[PDB]
Amino acid sequence: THPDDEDSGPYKHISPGDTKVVVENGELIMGILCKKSLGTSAGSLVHISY
């Protein structure tokens, strides 16, 4: 997603920043879904589901 500070923000405290999406055991833990999560992407939720 546009969010945060590519290349150096996640390395700055992981102040969860909520941007990055994490799903675990079939439950959405954090983040916001977009075309990169849901779209025709190589690693989208939809691809993994199939």
Partner: protein, 170 residues
């Protein structure tokens, strides 16, 4: 002593090298023998060429041309006073001459313009935006193609030339 010779063509080439050394009468003020030196030069050239070929003849003339330059009488004066030994004069391998105050600059300037011909053909695709998630550099290019589109909308394509890496905006 000057090395013995008998060939008439070699003798006349020495005479011409001597005659070229006579230019501007600098030989008088220095008082150096132009006939012994011209012979030593010619011997040294002949020691290189080993015959009286066109290539030797061209070399004799270019040696002559160096002596007869109007803008650099100091080259001759350097040869006349022994600052340049005949064996060195015999070879143009040590460059060509650079005491005329401008042509050397110009050749340097030529060396600049062909080096100017190297500088970057024409740099571009710098916009300089997003940071790469591989080689950690911001030097990046973006591509804008297919307007409106059929069903793959004018998405923004960003490529890191720095390591041939490409990702999309969102």
């Amino acid at each position: 002593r000057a090395p013995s010779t008998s060939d008439s063509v070699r003798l006349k080439c020495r005479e011409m090298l001597a005659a070229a050394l006579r230019t501007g009468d600098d030989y008088i003020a220095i008082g150096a023998d132009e006939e012994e030196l011209g012979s030593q030069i010619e011997e040294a050239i002949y020691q290189e060429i080993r015959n009286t070929d066109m290539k030797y003849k061209n070399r004799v003339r270019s040696r002559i041309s160096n002596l007869k330059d109007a803008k650099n009488p100091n080259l001759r004066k350097n040869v006349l006073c022994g600052n340049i030994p005949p064996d060195l004069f015999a070879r143009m391998t040590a460059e060509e001459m650079a005491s005329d105050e401008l042509k050397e600059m110009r050749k340097n300037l030529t060396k600049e313009a062909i080096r100017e011909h190297q500088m970057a053909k024409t740099g571009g695709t710098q916009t300089d935006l997003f940071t790469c998630g591989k080689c950690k550099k911001k030097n990046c290019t973006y591509t804008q193609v297919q307007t409106r589109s059929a069903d793959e909308p004018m998405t923004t394509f960003v490529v890191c030339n720095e390591c041939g890496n490409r990702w999309k905006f969102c």
